[PDB]
Design a protein around this ligand. Sequence first.
Ligand code: A1B4F
Ligand code: ZN
Length: 139
Amino acid sequence: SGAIYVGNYRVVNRHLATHNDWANLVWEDSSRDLLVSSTTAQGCDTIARCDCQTGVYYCSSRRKHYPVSFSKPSLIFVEASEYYPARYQSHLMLAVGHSEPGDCGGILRCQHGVVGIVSTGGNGLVGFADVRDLLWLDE
Ligand SMILES: Cc1cccc(CN2C[C@@H](C(N)=O)CCC2=O)c1
Ligand SMILES: [Zn+2]
């Protein structure tokens, strides 16, 4: 689990969004596994606006923050899971690292801010849903 709080927005994995998130929906994309909802309180996270490919992510299944190198956001085939059938997920970045389903929501950050959140994994890989292209999160 996990979320990003920026301005009056809350960014979560679409598959983990609550009834309140869907009731206060701003934008969602199943192909990205992202959902953004509005909030009443101001958040304190800063979204990175950059092309970094190194950062640190939180892995709840290890209670550890791992430094990683990650690929640029791309369209990647993602196997079937409890929440989606087998499909291509867009804006996904991969890294060699540990991840389990419950690790979704873990933040990936670089020197500039939040880059994205854990969204996929398995086989010694971890995939992160990019949020740096969502410029409207800043205003
Ligand atoms: C983080 C992770 C590790 C291993 C396996 C998974 C599988 N998975 C894929 C997610 C998606 N974005 O398609 C939806 C929910 C889910 O359980 C995730
Ligand atoms: Zn950066």
